[PDB]
């Protein structure tokens, strides 16, 4: 279910079949023209749409344009060369901008920023001042 497009030279490279490639799925109620992140234009097909891209940003940039410009909503996948797929956006079905009970704290310092140690204190260690 790929959208209507005449092709372009700004698509995927070897990295796709050798390193991870990304696909994005969305559902549209009607046929409308949208801008390609690597290409100028394309007509989306009513029903489910499937697009393959080369970067997570390119996929997420299309989502942003699909969101506040068309009122529609999508899923990102990471595809490996062997065939294993990963589910990325949204992580738990709920968007990262909205709090969801069940999420946890990652990478949080429990103090303000002026409270980091001097670099001379962590001398000859394999760390850094912001990892204490």
């Amino acid at each position: 279910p790929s959208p209507i497009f005449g092709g372009s030279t700004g698509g995927w490279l070897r990295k796709a079949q050798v390193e991870e490639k990304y696909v994005i799925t969305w559902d549209s109620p009607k046929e409308q023209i949208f801008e390609m992140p690597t290409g100028g234009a394309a007509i989306m097909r009513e029903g489910p749409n499937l697009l393959k891209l080369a970067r997570k940003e390119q996929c997420l940039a299309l989502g942003t344009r699909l969101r506040s410009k068309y009122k529609i909503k999508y899923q990102f996948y990471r595809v490996f060369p062997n065939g294993e797929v990963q589910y990325l956006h949204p992580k738990d079905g709920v968007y990262p901008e909205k709090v969801n009970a069940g999420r946890q704290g990652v990478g949080q310092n429990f103090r303000s920023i002026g409270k980091n140690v001097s670099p001379i204190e962590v001398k000859f260690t394999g760390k850094q001042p912001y990892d204490l």
């Binding site: 990295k15 080369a54 390119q58 999420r103 704290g105 990652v106 303000s112 920023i113």
Partner: protein, 80 residues
């Protein structure tokens, strides 16, 4: 990968999460500020390092912070 740390001066106004172009940050439950929510950096390996999150943070000084780290193909931002 890059390192993104989140300090306690975070007032939980979700503006860093809305600015991230590669889905690195998210909002989680927290009981230390009015909004009862703090930013979190669960996927720092998609972090490209563009610092859009810090341009969006209203606190002084910043609550979110990006530190340069070893570069992979993902943080280099390569399409090849």
């Amino acid at each position: 990968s890059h390192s993104v740390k989140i300090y306690d001066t975070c007032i939980g106004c979700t503006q860093c999460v809305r600015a991230c172009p590669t889905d690195v940050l998210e909002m989680i439950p927290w009981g230390g500020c009015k909004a009862k929510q703090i930013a979190s950096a669960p996927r720092t390996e998609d972090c490209v390092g563009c610092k859009r999150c810090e341009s969006a943070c209203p606190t002084d000084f910043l609550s979110v912070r990006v530190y340069l780290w070893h570069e992979t193909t993902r943080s280099m931002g390569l399409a090849y």
